[PDB]
Design a binder for these strands. Structure first.
Ligand SMILES: Nc1nc2c(ncn2[C@H]2CC[C@@H](COP(=O)(O)OP(=O)(O)OP(=O)(O)O)O2)c(=O)[nH]1
Length: 534
DNA sequence: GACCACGGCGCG
DNA sequence: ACGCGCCGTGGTC
């Protein structure tokens, strides 16, 4: 810092850069700087100076690296103080917060940013000393991962624009039809997009019972859950739910996506955020490609839009019940571990209401998804369509079949209260203080956040590690990693190597880290994201 | 134009 | 009575 010294910087310096916007793929490089040995180096011309650097180290290294790859420059990201802070406390998600917290100030000048990166790393890195397990995550997962992610953000994914443009016109017509029908029943036109106007119409201008109310402002809710219960109580309801689906997918996916194709690449680029979640998961944004619809017919039509480059094929890899398996391993429950040991499908195997294996099943498929979150009979009976206590009775059979689960939940909650945090299999930790709150609702909310983190975070660790190990193997085969959706990966491979890439990636993922239970991966190849599954 | 809270909903 | 990001609305600055 302080002493201004001419560019270029000495090797191994901390970089501070300024972008016109957050998205590195769309951002103009306004300023570039570096700091080292107590010196500040401000580049005369940012874009040119980019060539000098050998690797990116400093706050938000990956982003600068992404922009570098955009310009043909092979500039890999390295140390990033944000990554260290994220490992100390996953609540450290922003440079504004991190700086303020560890001896600095997040500015709009590259030099002060570069200097902030230098001292911020010194301090933070010191706080990580002794934390063997965290250091291991930083070196063996986080740091290397930042590079893999940088290459995914720069590669982007191919989108069938004309297809979506056409789908938009068809959906527009169907929306108009539902709009006219709803207005007819309402006896008058209003903003069907306005849940406020909808509330008045539904519960006041109609004999419709208000089931629940909104959290913050306490209005009569018009959530899908509420409307579901009223689907028979009125024709207009079903038409409103259908209107909801269409408008949701049209305004969020169908319309905005085509307009996001990058001019240089001709592909769709998302940002994979590394210090965003409280559990250790990745997040996707601008645009979010981890929530592309798939569960409904209309959603699946949208998913077909994501296609492979010509001469290429999409390879889709999904872990199967990875969080359940993580639980089986974390808890040590034999009667569960031995369900994945025998390769026996849990949902039907845990369909032990009587004996499989084989009738009421899928009621367990929702119990298994449900135990991870700590859902009670209410969310259960409602989503399963059964009496309130024809749901409670269920949940208790579960803890009797799998006692070691309850024991683990109990275990970690106790651990959490004591030291103030919980952790994953690899020692990634999340601080959750409200475990000692005197208000039950608040405390029981903290508890759910608390015992879910180790499970969801461990699965995140496994996927991350699997990506770090899988990446180099893909480069050697001229294949590329496109997207990650928490428990699934999407690769793009040349048709010829497609099947080879598929088999390899599968094994890299199944053996990423052996547990007291085998990890199972489903693999699919196709010209589009949808067909690449099944 | 920007950013906001909110209700709502897409995905794992 | 889990984890995210984005939409339109309604609203402010
Ligand atoms: N984490 C999470 N994932 C969900 C939820 N609802 C749906 N999904 C996604 C995750 C994977 C997929 C369900 O995968 P399963 O583990 O049921 O495996 P499957 O192939 O669907 O088996 P089956 O067809 O027998 O249900 O749907 C949810 O509430 N939480």
């Amino acid at each position: 810092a302080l002493e201004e010294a001419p560019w270029p910087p000495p090797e191994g310096a901390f970089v501070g850069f300024v972008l016109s916007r957050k998205e590195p793929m769309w951002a103009d490089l306004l300023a570039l700087a570096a700091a080292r040995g107590g010196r500040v180096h401000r580049a005369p011309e940012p874009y040119k100076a980019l060539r000098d650097l050998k690797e990116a180290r400093g706050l938000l290294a990956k982003d600068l690296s992404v922009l570098a790859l955009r310009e043909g420059l092979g500039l890999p990201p390295g140390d990033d103080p944000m990554l260290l802070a994220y490992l100390l406390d996953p609540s450290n998600t922003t440079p504004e917060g991190v700086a303020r917290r560890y001896g600095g100030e997040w500015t709009e000048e590259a030099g002060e940013r570069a200097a902030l990166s230098e001292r911020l790393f010194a301090n933070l890195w010191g706080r990580l000393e002794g934390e063997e397990r965290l250091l291991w995550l930083y070196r063996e997962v986080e740091r290397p991962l930042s590079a893999v992610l940088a290459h995914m953000e720069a590669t982007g994914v191919r989108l069938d624009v004309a297809y979506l443009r056409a789908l938009s016109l068809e959906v527009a017509e169907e929306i108009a039809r539902l709009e006219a029908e709803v207005f007819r029943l309402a006896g008058h036109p209003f903003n069907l997009n306005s849940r406020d106007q909808l509330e008045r119409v539904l519960f006041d201008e109609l004999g419709l019972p208000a089931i629940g109310k909104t959290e913050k402002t306490g209005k009569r809710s018009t959530s899908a859950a509420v409307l579901e219960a009223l689907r028979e109580a009125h024709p207009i309801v079903e038409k409103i739910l259908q209107y909801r689906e269409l408008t949701k997918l049209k305004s969020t996916y169908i319309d905005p996506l085509p307009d996001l194709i990058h001019p240089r690449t001709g592909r769709l680029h998302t940002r994979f955020n590394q210090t965003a979640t409280a559990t250790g998961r990745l997040s996707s944004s601008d645009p979010n490609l981890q929530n592309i619809p798939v569960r409904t017919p209309l959603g699946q039509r949208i998913r077909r839009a994501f296609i492979a480059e010509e001469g290429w094929l999409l390879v889709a890899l999904d872990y199967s019940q990875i969080e359940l398996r993580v639980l089986a391993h974390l808890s040590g429950d034999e009667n569960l571990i031995r369900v994945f040991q025998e390769g026996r499908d849990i949902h039907t195997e845990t369909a032990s209401w009587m004996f499989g294996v084989p009738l009421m099943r899928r009621a367990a498929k929702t119990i298994n998804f449900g135990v991870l979150y700590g859902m009670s009979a209410h969310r259960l009976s409602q989503e399963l369509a059964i009496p309130y206590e024809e749901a409670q009775a269920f949940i208790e059979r579960y803890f009797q079949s799998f006692p070691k689960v309850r024991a683990w939940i109990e275990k970690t909650l106790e651990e959490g209260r004591r030291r103030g945090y919980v952790e994953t299999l690899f020692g990634r930790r999340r601080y959750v203080p409200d475990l000692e709150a005197r208000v039950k609702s608040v405390r029981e909310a903290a508890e759910r956040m608390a015992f879910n983190m180790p499970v969801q975070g461990t699965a995140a660790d496994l996927m991350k590690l699997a990506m770090v190990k899988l990446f180099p193997r893909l480069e050697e085969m001229g294949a590329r990693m496109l997207l990650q959706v928490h428990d699934e990966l999407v690769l793009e491979a040349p048709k010829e190597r497609a099947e080879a890439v598929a088999r390899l990636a599968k094994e890299v993922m199944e053996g990423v880290y052996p547990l007291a239970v085998p990890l199972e991966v489903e693999v699919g190849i196709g010209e589009d994201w949808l067909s690449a599954k099944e």
